[PDB]
Amino acid sequence: MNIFEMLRIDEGLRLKIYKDTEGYYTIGIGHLLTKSPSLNAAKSELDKAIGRNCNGVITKDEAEKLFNQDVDAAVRGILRNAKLKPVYDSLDAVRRCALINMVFQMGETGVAGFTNSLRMLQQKRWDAAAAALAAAAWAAATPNRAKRVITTFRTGTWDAYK
C-alpha cells in the first residue's frame, strides 16, 4: 500500500469524466473538475489540469498524480489547522494516511470534532482510541470503511486493505 491505494479501495477510481451526488463533474478519485453545468467547461479544466488533449478520459497514473495533489492540498490544510496539526505530527506514516482518509471523507471540521479521540491518538493509546471511534455516529454511517480505517489506527499496518 499507500494512501492512493487505500482510497482506490474506499472511494473508488473513475478514469472518465463523471458527475457526483451533487452532480459536479469529477474525475479520478474524487477530483472535482468544476461546478458549472458545462461539460465543455470541465473538459477544459481537465485538459488544463493534466495538460493535453485528454478529451474526458485519463490514465490510471494521471489520476494518481491529481490524487497526490489533493492529498497535498488536504494535509496542507491539516497542518494549518490548530486541533489537527498536533496529532498529525505525532502520527506515524500509516496512521497519517488514515487521518487523510478521514478528512477526505468528512473534512477538517469533522475530523476536528473527534476531541477525546484525537487526544488518545496523540497519546498513542491505539486501543482506547480504536474503541472510542467504534462508538461514534460515523461507524454507524459507514460501517465498512469505518472499520478498515479503525484497524489502521489500531495496527498501523495495511492489513485491513491488503
Side-chain angles (χ1 to χ4, degrees), residues 28-116:
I29 313 211
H31 185 59
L32 174 154
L33 282 179
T34 125
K35 359 160 67 101
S36 109
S38 184
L39 191 35
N40 176 278
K43 261 159 88 125
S44 143
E45 285 325 336
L46 187 83
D47 286 322
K48 245 249 308 208
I50 84 125
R52 64 169 182 91
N53 29 80
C54 359
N55 197 60
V57 172
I58 44 114
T59 120
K60 213 289 294 141
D61 273 355
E62 268 180 337
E64 163 169 27
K65 149 98 139 41
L66 302 170
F67 168 87
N68 279 189
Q69 286 167 194
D70 299 359
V71 127
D72 285 18
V75 179
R76 250 162 253 135
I78 297 158
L79 303 186
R80 286 150 12 173
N81 171 338
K83 335 212 135 54
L84 285 145
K85 215 206 131 316
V87 165
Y88 186 80
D89 279 296
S90 59
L91 296 190
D92 45 307
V94 150
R95 8 168 124 53
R96 285 262 179 95
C97 285
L99 214 25
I100 289 115
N101 190 297
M102 264 191 88
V103 141
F104 238 84
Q105 151 205 339
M106 51 134 92
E108 297 208 335
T109 310
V111 202
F114 289 81
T115 296
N116 283 185

XYZ file of all heavy atoms in Angstrom, residues 28-116:
668
model
N -11.143 10.886 -11.640
C -10.149 10.165 -10.847
C -10.785 9.733 -9.537
O -11.923 9.282 -9.534
N -10.046 9.904 -8.429
C -10.512 9.548 -7.086
C -11.166 10.709 -6.335
O -10.740 11.054 -5.238
C -9.379 8.977 -6.235
C -8.572 7.926 -7.011
C -9.958 8.395 -4.944
C -7.980 6.827 -6.129
N -12.201 11.312 -6.931
C -12.895 12.443 -6.321
C -12.239 13.801 -6.614
O -12.114 14.648 -5.689
N -11.693 13.951 -7.817
C -11.064 15.191 -8.251
C -12.127 16.045 -8.934
O -12.408 15.884 -10.133
C -9.858 14.994 -9.185
C -9.197 16.307 -9.475
N -8.687 17.103 -8.466
C -9.000 16.960 -10.648
C -8.193 18.200 -9.035
N -8.372 18.151 -10.350
N -12.756 16.936 -8.159
C -13.842 17.755 -8.686
C -13.373 18.656 -9.749
O -12.636 19.563 -9.453
C -14.524 18.623 -7.625
C -15.548 19.559 -8.222
C -16.528 19.846 -7.135
C -14.927 20.882 -8.484
N -13.831 18.454 -10.972
C -13.392 19.296 -12.085
C -13.795 20.752 -12.064
O -12.942 21.588 -12.105
C -13.681 18.625 -13.417
C -12.614 17.561 -13.648
C -12.858 16.818 -14.948
C -11.242 18.234 -13.697
N -15.085 21.030 -11.981
C -15.661 22.358 -11.945
C -17.101 22.187 -11.504
O -17.542 21.074 -11.612
C -15.713 22.939 -13.345
O -17.065 23.289 -13.534
C -15.370 21.863 -14.352
N -17.796 23.251 -11.032
C -19.169 23.146 -10.571
C -20.157 24.014 -11.384
O -21.111 24.655 -10.846
C -19.249 23.433 -9.090
C -17.916 23.734 -8.457
C -18.077 24.475 -7.144
C -18.740 23.641 -6.052
N -17.777 23.079 -5.087
N -19.875 24.036 -12.701
C -20.655 24.757 -13.677
C -21.213 23.736 -14.610
O -20.514 22.860 -15.104
C -19.844 25.790 -14.422
O -19.663 25.356 -15.758
N -22.502 23.826 -14.796
C -23.246 22.881 -15.578
C -22.720 22.636 -16.977
O -23.466 22.189 -17.834
C -24.683 23.390 -15.609
C -24.649 24.797 -15.036
C -23.285 25.006 -14.413
N -21.454 22.917 -17.235
C -20.947 22.699 -18.578
C -19.963 21.556 -18.694
O -18.990 21.495 -17.950
C -20.331 23.955 -19.176
O -19.933 23.696 -20.508
N -20.216 20.685 -19.679
C -19.322 19.585 -19.967
C -18.028 20.164 -20.496
O -16.960 19.966 -19.911
C -19.888 18.551 -20.947
C -19.027 17.274 -21.032
C -18.408 16.919 -19.679
C -19.836 16.072 -21.527
N -18.145 20.917 -21.587
C -17.032 21.628 -22.240
C -16.080 22.260 -21.225
O -14.857 22.116 -21.309
C -17.600 22.742 -23.168
C -16.602 23.664 -23.875
O -16.097 24.640 -23.307
N -16.367 23.409 -25.158
N -16.688 22.960 -20.281
C -16.009 23.633 -19.215
C -15.070 22.705 -18.456
O -13.904 23.004 -18.285
C -17.117 24.145 -18.302
N -15.632 21.586 -17.984
C -14.936 20.575 -17.221
C -13.926 19.899 -18.098
O -12.815 19.539 -17.705
C -15.931 19.548 -16.701
N -14.338 19.718 -19.321
C -13.438 19.094 -20.232
C -12.224 19.999 -20.410
O -11.096 19.562 -20.601
C -14.135 18.763 -21.541
C -14.576 17.313 -21.617
C -15.681 17.095 -22.637
C -15.153 16.825 -24.041
N -15.678 15.566 -24.596
N -12.448 21.282 -20.312
C -11.331 22.166 -20.463
C -10.430 22.162 -19.230
O -9.201 22.026 -19.339
C -11.782 23.576 -20.815
O -10.958 24.538 -20.172
N -11.060 22.337 -18.055
C -10.342 22.392 -16.798
C -9.477 21.194 -16.702
O -8.329 21.281 -16.305
C -11.255 22.442 -15.568
C -11.913 23.818 -15.343
C -11.034 24.994 -15.715
O -9.805 24.938 -15.737
O -11.744 26.069 -16.024
N -10.061 20.080 -17.109
C -9.382 18.810 -17.119
C -8.071 18.948 -17.822
O -7.048 19.047 -17.148
C -10.226 17.751 -17.843
C -9.673 16.339 -17.765
C -10.105 15.712 -16.435
C -10.252 15.544 -18.933
N -8.160 18.943 -19.165
C -7.042 19.041 -20.078
C -5.993 19.935 -19.529
O -4.833 19.609 -19.508
C -7.500 19.634 -21.398
C -8.281 18.652 -22.190
O -8.006 17.479 -22.221
O -9.286 19.188 -22.824
N -6.485 21.050 -19.033
C -5.729 22.115 -18.398
C -4.939 21.599 -17.200
O -3.753 21.886 -17.029
C -6.731 23.164 -17.884
C -6.660 24.548 -18.532
C -6.141 25.605 -17.573
C -6.903 25.623 -16.255
N -6.925 26.941 -15.590
N -5.677 20.867 -16.360
C -5.226 20.267 -15.124
C -4.123 19.266 -15.373
O -3.090 19.236 -14.716
C -6.420 19.549 -14.460
N -4.370 18.379 -16.293
C -3.385 17.392 -16.530
C -2.441 17.860 -17.633
O -1.218 17.693 -17.547
C -3.970 15.978 -16.616
C -4.477 15.695 -18.017
C -5.089 15.735 -15.587
C -3.847 14.440 -18.591
N -2.989 18.552 -18.633
C -2.132 19.077 -19.687
C -2.034 18.231 -20.940
O -1.083 17.476 -21.104
N -3.006 18.431 -21.826
C -3.132 17.770 -23.104
C -4.567 17.648 -23.612
O -5.522 18.252 -23.141
C -2.545 16.384 -23.135
C -3.243 15.402 -22.210
C -2.733 14.018 -22.554
N -3.341 12.941 -21.784
C -4.432 12.267 -22.169
N -5.087 12.550 -23.293
N -4.891 11.267 -21.407
N -4.678 16.830 -24.626
C -5.895 16.556 -25.312
C -6.586 15.308 -24.737
O -6.967 14.429 -25.497
C -5.558 16.379 -26.822
C -4.144 15.831 -27.107
O -3.904 14.600 -27.007
N -3.210 16.736 -27.465
N -6.760 15.214 -23.401
C -7.386 14.042 -22.765
C -8.782 13.706 -23.270
O -9.159 12.530 -23.436
C -7.399 14.120 -21.238
S -6.600 15.626 -20.678
N -9.580 14.744 -23.504
C -10.936 14.554 -24.007
C -11.840 13.709 -23.133
O -12.508 12.835 -23.657
C -10.962 13.958 -25.430
C -12.302 14.137 -26.125
O -12.775 15.260 -26.332
N -12.918 13.020 -26.490
N -11.874 13.972 -21.830
C -12.765 13.256 -20.920
C -12.269 11.957 -20.272
O -12.967 11.372 -19.444
N -11.093 11.473 -20.641
C -10.590 10.239 -20.046
C -9.110 10.308 -19.782
O -8.348 10.796 -20.623
C -10.964 8.999 -20.835
C -10.246 7.784 -20.278
C -12.462 8.780 -20.666
N -8.710 9.840 -18.594
C -7.305 9.891 -18.238
C -6.740 8.566 -17.791
O -7.471 7.611 -17.514
C -6.986 10.999 -17.250
C -8.056 11.034 -16.139
C -6.839 12.331 -18.016
C -7.497 10.672 -14.768
N -5.415 8.497 -17.757
C -4.776 7.272 -17.348
C -4.807 7.121 -15.845
O -4.941 8.095 -15.096
C -3.345 7.148 -17.911
O -2.330 7.050 -16.896
C -3.068 8.316 -18.853
N -4.652 5.865 -15.447
C -4.627 5.442 -14.071
C -3.514 6.114 -13.274
O -3.621 6.352 -12.071
C -4.485 3.951 -14.044
C -5.209 3.382 -12.853
C -4.478 3.738 -11.584
C -3.111 3.055 -11.533
N -2.024 3.881 -10.981
N -2.441 6.421 -13.987
C -1.278 7.098 -13.448
C -1.516 8.620 -13.369
O -1.006 9.307 -12.472
C -0.037 6.781 -14.333
C 0.766 5.523 -14.004
O 0.579 4.771 -13.059
O 1.724 5.328 -14.859
N -2.306 9.119 -14.340
C -2.677 10.512 -14.496
C -3.554 10.977 -13.375
O -3.579 12.155 -13.030
C -3.460 10.677 -15.787
C -2.557 11.040 -16.955
C -3.327 11.215 -18.225
O -4.435 10.695 -18.426
O -2.660 11.958 -19.088
N -4.317 10.013 -12.855
C -5.260 10.208 -11.769
C -4.549 10.157 -10.445
O -4.889 10.902 -9.532
C -6.388 9.180 -11.813
N -3.567 9.263 -10.355
C -2.797 9.150 -9.141
C -2.227 10.538 -8.786
O -2.435 11.055 -7.670
C -1.727 8.066 -9.309
C -0.612 8.145 -8.264
C 0.260 6.932 -8.307
O 0.442 6.236 -9.307
O 0.766 6.701 -7.129
N -1.579 11.155 -9.786
C -0.994 12.484 -9.667
C -1.966 13.526 -9.114
O -1.662 14.212 -8.142
C -0.447 12.976 -10.982
C -0.559 14.477 -11.055
C 0.737 15.155 -10.687
C 1.007 16.321 -11.622
N -0.203 17.126 -11.939
N -3.123 13.667 -9.763
C -4.142 14.583 -9.274
C -4.403 14.238 -7.799
O -4.249 15.058 -6.922
C -5.473 14.504 -10.079
C -5.418 14.782 -11.595
C -6.770 14.421 -12.227
C -5.114 16.242 -11.869
N -4.717 12.966 -7.545
C -4.925 12.423 -6.212
C -3.830 12.882 -5.279
O -4.114 13.399 -4.223
C -4.925 10.881 -6.194
C -4.860 10.361 -4.773
C -6.045 10.196 -4.056
C -3.637 10.122 -4.139
C -6.026 9.760 -2.732
C -3.596 9.678 -2.816
C -4.793 9.494 -2.133
N -2.584 12.732 -5.694
C -1.497 13.223 -4.861
C -1.689 14.721 -4.569
O -1.691 15.166 -3.424
C -0.098 13.027 -5.506
C 0.566 11.647 -5.399
O 1.756 11.517 -5.750
N -0.181 10.622 -4.955
N -1.884 15.511 -5.612
C -2.043 16.957 -5.449
C -3.121 17.361 -4.473
O -3.133 18.493 -3.987
C -2.219 17.708 -6.793
C -0.899 17.818 -7.603
C -1.102 18.262 -9.047
O -0.188 18.160 -9.895
N -2.300 18.793 -9.315
N -4.050 16.433 -4.249
C -5.164 16.669 -3.357
C -4.869 16.201 -1.974
O -5.464 16.690 -1.027
C -6.467 16.061 -3.829
C -6.860 16.641 -5.120
O -6.200 17.497 -5.664
O -7.983 16.146 -5.571
N -3.975 15.242 -1.863
C -3.600 14.812 -0.557
C -2.886 15.996 0.012
O -3.185 16.487 1.098
C -2.607 13.647 -0.633
C -1.343 13.920 0.191
C -3.260 12.312 -0.192
N -1.951 16.458 -0.823
C -1.079 17.562 -0.538
C -1.880 18.719 0.005
O -1.703 19.114 1.141
C -0.137 17.867 -1.684
C 0.999 16.871 -1.816
O 0.991 15.729 -1.288
O 1.986 17.300 -2.513
N -2.850 19.121 -0.791
C -3.836 20.162 -0.526
C -4.612 19.972 0.766
O -5.039 20.938 1.401
C -4.869 20.037 -1.629
N -4.866 18.713 1.080
C -5.624 18.293 2.254
C -4.782 18.233 3.528
O -5.290 18.478 4.634
C -6.378 16.975 2.015
N -3.502 17.923 3.374
C -2.625 17.849 4.512
C -2.235 19.266 4.881
O -2.149 19.616 6.069
C -1.389 16.964 4.191
C -0.370 16.846 5.327
C -1.840 15.575 3.781
N -1.992 20.074 3.819
C -1.562 21.463 3.950
C -2.504 22.115 4.883
O -2.124 22.847 5.776
C -1.521 22.216 2.636
C -0.103 22.518 2.180
C -0.076 22.865 0.687
N 0.500 21.827 -0.181
C -0.020 21.401 -1.362
N -1.129 21.921 -1.913
N 0.638 20.468 -2.010
N -3.742 21.734 4.675
C -4.865 22.163 5.458
C -4.786 21.609 6.866
O -5.118 22.310 7.804
N -4.392 20.343 7.017
C -4.267 19.714 8.342
C -3.170 20.382 9.196
O -3.300 20.574 10.418
C -4.074 18.193 8.259
C -5.272 17.524 7.639
C -3.845 17.566 9.630
C -4.890 16.174 7.064
N -2.066 20.751 8.566
C -1.041 21.428 9.322
C -1.551 22.816 9.727
O -1.581 23.191 10.893
C 0.288 21.392 8.568
C 0.594 19.928 8.322
C 1.962 19.689 7.702
C 0.549 19.230 9.663
N -2.065 23.551 8.763
C -2.605 24.854 9.027
C -3.775 24.830 10.005
O -4.339 25.886 10.279
C -2.988 25.576 7.736
C -1.783 26.090 6.935
C -1.983 26.145 5.408
N -3.380 25.964 4.966
C -3.849 26.092 3.706
N -3.070 26.438 2.667
N -5.156 25.883 3.503
N -4.160 23.641 10.512
C -5.256 23.509 11.491
C -4.649 23.316 12.882
O -3.669 22.579 13.060
C -6.354 22.467 11.116
C -7.403 22.140 12.185
O -7.183 22.334 13.386
N -8.540 21.578 11.756
N -5.244 24.029 13.842
C -4.844 24.086 15.239
C -5.063 22.838 16.035
O -4.221 22.509 16.875
C -5.601 25.181 15.947
N -6.223 22.205 15.809
C -6.624 20.977 16.501
C -5.989 19.729 15.893
O -5.597 18.810 16.632
C -8.141 20.785 16.544
C -8.935 22.069 16.443
C -10.221 21.978 17.228
C -10.482 23.223 18.062
N -10.442 24.469 17.276
N -5.910 19.745 14.538
C -5.372 18.667 13.693
C -3.838 18.595 13.621
O -3.279 17.515 13.626
C -6.000 18.678 12.272
C -7.428 18.131 12.243
C -8.317 18.839 11.225
C -7.385 16.645 11.942
N -3.167 19.743 13.537
C -1.739 19.798 13.435
C -0.971 18.973 14.468
O -0.074 18.188 14.148
C -1.235 21.234 13.373
C 0.000 21.406 12.482
C 0.886 22.586 12.852
C 2.361 22.183 12.945
N 2.594 20.907 13.664
N -1.258 19.189 15.724
C -0.545 18.483 16.758
C -0.618 16.965 16.618
O 0.434 16.311 16.521
C -1.123 18.941 18.088
C -2.340 19.810 17.755
C -2.480 19.826 16.238
N -1.839 16.397 16.597
C -1.954 14.948 16.444
C -1.238 14.414 15.204
O -0.524 13.429 15.277
C -3.360 14.461 16.379
C -3.307 13.036 15.861
C -3.999 14.506 17.752
N -1.437 15.076 14.057
C -0.859 14.703 12.769
C 0.609 14.489 12.800
O 1.076 13.629 12.105
C -1.201 15.662 11.632
C -0.726 15.201 10.274
C -1.437 14.256 9.532
C 0.397 15.790 9.696
C -1.015 13.856 8.262
C 0.813 15.420 8.420
C 0.116 14.449 7.701
O 0.566 14.099 6.452
N 1.315 15.268 13.619
C 2.779 15.160 13.759
C 3.144 14.024 14.671
O 4.260 13.575 14.657
C 3.410 16.421 14.430
C 3.660 17.634 13.593
O 4.522 17.615 12.580
O 3.053 18.731 14.014
N 2.238 13.632 15.538
C 2.543 12.579 16.472
C 2.308 11.218 15.826
O 2.652 10.152 16.361
C 1.782 12.770 17.806
O 0.366 12.803 17.625
N 1.706 11.289 14.643
C 1.354 10.117 13.891
C 2.505 9.543 13.093
O 3.478 10.180 12.735
C 0.090 10.346 13.038
C -1.152 10.622 13.904
C -2.471 10.621 13.097
C -1.168 9.651 15.097
N 2.397 8.276 12.829
C 3.400 7.644 12.050
C 2.848 7.403 10.683
O 1.673 7.122 10.582
C 3.794 6.309 12.707
C 2.575 5.511 13.164
O 1.717 6.044 13.896
O 2.655 4.361 12.734
N 3.694 7.559 9.683
C 3.438 7.389 8.257
C 2.056 6.919 7.882
O 1.290 7.716 7.308
C 4.497 6.484 7.631
N 1.775 5.631 8.244
C 0.500 4.941 8.006
C -0.692 5.565 8.735
O -1.654 5.913 8.072
C 0.508 3.418 8.153
C -0.858 2.931 8.618
C 0.710 2.785 6.801
N -0.684 5.753 10.059
C -1.841 6.447 10.626
C -1.922 7.978 10.202
O -2.797 8.762 10.620
C -2.164 6.171 12.096
C -1.128 5.344 12.865
C -1.368 5.368 14.397
N -1.517 4.043 14.998
C -0.603 3.125 14.789
N 0.470 3.406 14.081
N -0.749 1.908 15.283
N -1.019 8.425 9.325
C -1.148 9.770 8.825
C -2.192 9.646 7.744
O -3.036 10.529 7.545
C 0.115 10.329 8.176
C 1.176 10.717 9.188
C 1.211 12.200 9.527
N 2.253 12.545 10.530
C 3.523 13.001 10.325
N 4.036 13.158 9.111
N 4.301 13.296 11.375
N -2.081 8.483 7.065
C -2.908 8.044 5.954
C -4.318 7.781 6.335
O -5.190 8.005 5.531
C -2.366 6.804 5.261
S -0.932 7.138 4.220
N -4.533 7.295 7.544
C -5.896 7.051 7.996
C -6.651 8.381 8.209
O -7.803 8.525 7.843
C -5.925 6.160 9.225
N -5.960 9.365 8.759
C -6.495 10.696 9.009
C -6.821 11.382 7.714
O -7.738 12.193 7.642
C -5.458 11.615 9.733
C -6.052 12.617 10.725
C -7.384 12.076 11.222
C -5.116 12.779 11.918
N -6.018 11.135 6.703
C -6.304 11.843 5.491
C -7.596 11.316 4.965
O -8.434 12.090 4.510
C -5.218 11.767 4.404
C -3.948 12.563 4.752
C -5.802 12.248 3.073
C -2.716 11.682 4.928
N -7.716 9.980 5.070
C -8.872 9.212 4.615
C -10.126 9.595 5.359
O -11.227 9.378 4.900
C -8.663 7.697 4.789
C -9.729 6.854 4.117
O -10.935 6.905 4.474
N -9.275 6.069 3.148
N -9.921 10.131 6.545
C -10.986 10.574 7.398
C -11.363 12.016 7.069
O -12.544 12.380 7.063
C -10.610 10.419 8.870
C -11.141 9.118 9.440
S -10.968 9.103 11.235
C -12.523 9.898 11.716
N -10.368 12.864 6.804
C -10.720 14.215 6.468
C -11.363 14.145 5.117
O -12.421 14.720 4.891
C -9.538 15.171 6.438
C -9.686 16.150 5.277
C -9.436 15.943 7.741
N -10.696 13.381 4.253
C -11.102 13.165 2.884
C -12.578 12.840 2.811
O -13.301 13.298 1.928
C -10.285 12.035 2.221
C -9.517 12.396 0.953
C -8.251 12.986 1.019
C -10.028 12.065 -0.306
C -7.530 13.273 -0.140
C -9.323 12.363 -1.474
C -8.068 12.964 -1.389
N -13.045 12.026 3.737
C -14.448 11.654 3.713
C -15.355 12.586 4.505
O -16.548 12.688 4.215
C -14.685 10.199 4.152
C -16.065 10.003 4.797
C -16.100 8.835 5.750
O -15.247 7.930 5.669
N -17.092 8.837 6.652
N -14.807 13.266 5.510
C -15.643 14.119 6.320
C -14.984 15.423 6.741
O -15.264 15.968 7.804
C -16.227 13.324 7.507
C -15.196 12.561 8.316
S -15.490 12.830 10.071
C -16.579 11.434 10.450
N -14.112 15.900 5.861
C -13.359 17.138 6.013
C -12.881 17.496 7.414
O -13.265 16.926 8.454
N -12.041 18.519 7.378
C -11.388 19.095 8.531
C -12.301 19.298 9.751
O -12.095 18.769 10.845
C -10.794 20.453 8.120
C -9.710 20.405 7.037
C -8.782 21.578 7.223
O -9.142 22.597 7.775
O -7.555 21.389 6.791
N -13.280 20.132 9.549
C -14.197 20.478 10.582
C -14.730 19.281 11.317
O -14.818 19.271 12.542
C -15.294 21.306 9.953
O -14.655 22.323 9.200
C -16.168 21.901 11.042
N -14.963 18.237 10.539
C -15.493 16.983 11.032
C -14.485 16.179 11.789
O -14.746 15.671 12.867
N -13.326 16.073 11.226
C -12.312 15.322 11.915
C -11.950 15.897 13.274
O -11.704 15.158 14.225
C -11.082 15.187 11.052
C -10.251 13.969 11.506
C -11.550 15.062 9.612
N -11.925 17.233 13.304
C -11.665 18.125 14.426
C -12.575 17.885 15.623
O -12.165 18.014 16.782
C -11.982 19.525 13.931
N -13.844 17.576 15.320
C -14.832 17.257 16.338
C -14.473 16.000 17.163
O -14.990 15.829 18.257
N -13.589 15.135 16.655
C -13.189 13.951 17.368
C -12.215 14.165 18.534
O -11.291 13.369 18.693
C -12.786 12.786 16.423
C -13.978 12.176 15.682
C -14.491 12.791 14.522
C -14.622 11.010 16.108
C -15.592 12.274 13.859
C -15.741 10.491 15.473
C -16.214 11.112 14.298
N -12.474 15.193 19.382
C -11.697 15.558 20.593
C -11.046 14.412 21.353
O -9.892 14.108 21.144
C -12.546 16.309 21.622
O -12.966 17.545 21.068
C -11.742 16.495 22.918
N -11.783 13.791 22.270
C -11.255 12.683 23.060
C -10.517 11.621 22.233
O -9.599 10.927 22.701
C -12.332 12.066 23.962
C -12.589 12.927 25.185
O -13.368 12.536 26.087
N -11.964 14.125 25.185
